[PDB]
């Protein structure tokens, strides 16, 4: 009720921990209780956690706040990188 302006989800991929919990159109109001105002803030967050980790993500849908359980996973493009902030 004061122009939040956070982050806009990307997509919903099958066989992923975000599927069924997070959907396209939903925004991120916070993570594990941390308020997100920048995309870079997400880079530090994932950096702290490693592959196989577990992070609680907050998102709002139609005024209905719900938490999403996402698991950090490495990427072939950058194996030395964990969670690039994808849904």
Q: Which domain CATH number covers 38?
A: 2.30.42.10
β-pairing, 27-31 vs 64-70, is: unpaired
CA 72, distance to chain mean position in Å, is 10
Backbone angles phi, psi at 39, to 5 degrees: -70, -30
DSSP string, 15-60: TSTTBTTB-TT-EEEEETTBPP--HHHHHHHHHHS-TT--EEEEEE
What residue numbers bound the domain in which 19 lies? 1-83
| CA dist., res. 32 & res. 46, Å (int) | 12
What is the number of domains present in the chain?
1
């Amino acid at each position: 009720m004061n122009e939040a302006k956070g982050v806009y989800v990307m997509s919903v991929l099958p066989n992923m921990p975000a599927a069924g919990r997070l959907e396209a159109g939903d925004r991120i109001a916070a993570i594990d209780g941390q308020p997100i105002n920048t995309s870079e803030q997400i880079v530090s967050y994932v950096r702290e956690k490693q592959a196989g980790d577990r992070v609680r993500v907050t998102f709002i849908r139609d005024r209905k706040q719900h938490e999403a359980e996402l698991v950090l996973k490495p990427f072939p493009h950058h194996p030395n990188q964990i969670g690039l902030g994808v849904t």
